[PDB]
Structures are given as C-alpha cells and as structure tokens.
C-alpha cells in the first residue's frame, strides 16, 4: 500500500516465531523499541498489528518516535511511547521499473498534524489562501497528493524501500499470541527433574 493509505492487519490466536525473522539475514533495518529482539520469544501479548508500505530510501528515518517531517505529520506518525519493531529493506528490483512506477503516492499538504495511528484517504482540494477553491485547481489551490517516480538508474537514497511496523498490544485478555516452547525426549527409570506444562 501507499504511505498515505498504509494497510493494517491484526494477528492473534497463533504461535509466532520471531527468531526466524531475526535471523533472516536479508532485512536492512531492524529497530525494536523497549523490547529485546532476542528475548521476544520469551514474551506473550494479546494481539499484534502489522502495517506495511513503500517509501523513499532517505525517508526511512522518519519512522520513529519523536520524528518531525512531512511523513511524520501528514502520512504516518508513531506515538512517542511506541513499543514494537520497525523493519525496512530495499525493493529496487521489484518496485523500481524502467520508465518509473507511479502507483505510490504521498500527501503534500494538510490542514493540521496527524495523531498516531490514523489514515487520510480524502482528496479534497487544499485551500492554501483565504479564498474558496470551489473545485478548481489553480493559484492557492493545490491537489493534496502527488506520486513518486521510481527509475532504475536512481540513487540508492531515492531508491524505494519497503517498511513494515509491528506493534504489540497488552490488555486484560487471554493474551493468546506468543512464541513456542521446546521439548526434550523423555527418560524413564531415573531420578529426573521434570516439567510437564506447569
């Protein structure tokens, strides 16, 4: 999805495996705020939210708490106390095509800043001046959205990057979603120290 229309997917009632993602050895960025990524398996939450989009390579550092910028103010803003992980990797061969890709758009102007975790799909003509636009684009009346152009020869800084944000939630609930547990083959006829579930 585009940055101005970032998609959401809730995940619950299953057994996650964070170590495989940790050791994929293919992602470019992996920052987890407030949680140990190597100890994520030894934790158990109620549900997780996954959000994905494609943005500019040079904008990847606006996806963080306490970030100021056009993306942080008009498209996608994270709360200052956000707990979870941010992942991003290059998509040169998949998203950048000869002639450019115009299927990805980003918002330019907005009347007010964005709170954490909401979307803006409206496309009403912005009113920069003190005169109503009345549906015609011109002086002091600009369209709110334009599109990126992804050319193969572009620099890595302007190369597209795919970004996924995982956010974990905690609430009074069964807290179903969390990682697995390992098991050893049983031994019999000896003094052993056992652990069967609890």
């Amino acid at each position: 999805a585009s940055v101005y229309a970032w998609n959401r997917k809730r995940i619950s009632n299953c057994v996650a495996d964070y170590s495989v993602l940790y050791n994929s050895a293919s992602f470019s960025t992996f920052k987890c705020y407030g949680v140990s990524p190597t100890k994520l398996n030894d934790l158990c939450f109620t549900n997780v939210y996954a959000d994905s989009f494609v943005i500019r390579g040079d904008e990847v550092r606006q996806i963080a708490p306490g970030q100021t910028g056009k993306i942080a103010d008009y498209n996608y803003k994270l709360p200052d106390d956000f707990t979870g992980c941010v992942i991003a990797w290059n998509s040169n061969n998949l998203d950048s095509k000869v002639g450019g890709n115009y299927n990805y758009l980003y918002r330019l102007f907005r009347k007010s800043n964005l709170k954490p975790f909401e979307r803006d799909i409206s496309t009403e003509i912005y009113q920069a001046g003190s005169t109503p636009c009345n549906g015609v684009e011109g002086f002091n009346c600009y369209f709110p959205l334009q599109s990126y152009g992804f050319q193969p020869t572009n620099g890595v800084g302007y190369q597209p990057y795919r970004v996924v944000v995982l956010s974990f939630e905690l609430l009074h609930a069964p807290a179903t979603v969390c990682g697995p547990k390992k098991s050893t083959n049983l031994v019999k006829n000896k003094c052993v120290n056992f652990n069967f579930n609890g």
Partner: antibody, heavy 121, light 109 residues
Framework: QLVQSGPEVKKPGTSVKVSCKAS????????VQWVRQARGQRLEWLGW????????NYAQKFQERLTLTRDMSTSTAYMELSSLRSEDTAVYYC????????????????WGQGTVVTVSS | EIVLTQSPGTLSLSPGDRAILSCRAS???????LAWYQQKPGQAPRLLIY???SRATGIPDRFSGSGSGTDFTLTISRLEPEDFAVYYC?????????FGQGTKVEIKR
C-alpha cells in the same frame, strides 16, 4: 525577500540559467512566477510554478524553450532558457507571495531585484 | 485567452487633482484574481491593489480599486509627487496571465 543572480552576457544559440533564492518565510507553500521586461517596454509574462509539487505552467510562445525547476535544499527556483536570440536581452524578475504557515498572502507582494541578460556576439 | 487593455494612455495631471485609470478585459475575469502594480523607472514593480477591492500592506488609503466584470477602475484621490509612475493591471484566473500595456502619469506645467 528574494535574491537573484548577477547579470550576464551570452552568445546566440546557447542556454542560460537564472536563480531566485528565497529566505525569511515558509518557501514550501509559495509559488513563483517569472516576468521579463525589455528596455523601456511592456512587461511580458513567461510562466509560473508551484513549489510544493513542482508543477509548472508556461505561455505558448516559450512552451518549448523555457523550463522552471526548484530545489528544496536551498529554497531556490531556476529558469533555464535555451536557444537565446538577440531580442531576449532584457531584465527578469521572480515574484512569490509571503507564506507564514498554511495560510498565505493572496498576491505577489514579494518581488526580486531583477537580473540583466544580454545576448549578442 | 484573456486580453487586458488600459484605455487611458498617458495623463498629465498637476498634483492635487483626482486621477482615474481604467483596465478592461475581453471576457469575464474573476474578481478574486486581479491586481494593480506600480513601477518606477529602474525598480521592481510594487503591488498596490489585490482582489479588485482591497489594498496591499502599507499602501495609503488614497488608492482605491473598484468595478467588477469586464471593467475595473483605479482611483487616486489626491496626487503627491511620488505617485507618478507606470501602472499595470494583471489577472491570474486563467492560464495565460497577460499584463496590460501600462499607463504613464506625469506632471503638467
């Protein structure tokens, strides 16, 4: 306030680039129009461009020779005009409104100091 | 397109009197995209009236715009020596923002 580049003298059959730098106001929400005037003549309109998205509009006479660009790093607008002739010798001005925030002034109150361009041999 | 013409070419008026300037268009022009600019020899133009009715910042009250539709008028109530320049009328509603030929105001003796 707007600051333009210095005057210049070029040769026919070439291209010239003129810079208009802006400071002291929100350059993100503004828009720049270019007006040239000969010696003791009437003002002639060339085109305009919205800095926010880079979209530009040109007059029909200079449709295929005039190109307007911008850079957000230095808040500067650029004219490039190719295949100059003798009659192109004139003074150029960049005009843009005063933007303080989302709202902006409804007129081109801010004007540059002009740039002198002479084309001859 | 839209063509703007200033009917009074040059006016030789002694200071004190009332000065009138007229700008006329071929087609209807939006009343929210008209402006008057004052230019002296050797200086960049200065905005005087915008929006066909309201004046700019710091412009004295004596200047007054009026009219709507195909006709627009600029009025100077009393002349002062620094008010002799060339005045242009511009519209920026359509795509070509054509100017006017201009009117020169000089003293009379």
């Amino acid at each position: 306030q707007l600051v333009q580049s210095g005057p210049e003298v070029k040769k026919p059959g070439t291209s010239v680039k003129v810079s208009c730098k802006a400071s002291g106001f929100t350059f993100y929400y503004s828009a720049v129009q270019w007006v040239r005037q000969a010696r003791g003549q009437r003002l002639e309109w060339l085109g305009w461009m919205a800095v926010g998205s880079g979209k530009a509009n040109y007059a029909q006479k200079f449709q295929e020779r005039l190109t307007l660009t911008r850079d957000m790093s230095t808040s500067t607008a650029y004219m490039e005009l190719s295949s100059l002739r003798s009659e192109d010798t004139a003074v150029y001005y960049c005009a843009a409104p005063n933007c303080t925030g989302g709202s902006c002034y409804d007129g081109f109150n801010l004007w540059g100091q002009g740039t002198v361009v002479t084309v001859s041999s | 397109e839209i063509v703007l013409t200033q009917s009074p070419g040059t006016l030789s008026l002694s200071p004190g009197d009332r000065a009138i300037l007229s700008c006329r268009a071929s087609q209807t022009v939006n009343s929210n995209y008209l402006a008057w600019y004052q230019q002296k020899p050797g200086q960049a133009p200065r905005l005087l009236i915008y929006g066909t009715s309201s004046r700019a910042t710091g412009i004295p009250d004596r200047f007054s715009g009026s009219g709507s539709g195909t006709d627009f008028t600029l009025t100077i109530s009393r002349l002062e020596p620094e008010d002799f320049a060339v005045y242009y009328c511009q519209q920026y509603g359509s795509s070509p923002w054509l100017f006017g030929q201009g009117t020169k105001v000089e003293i009379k003796r």
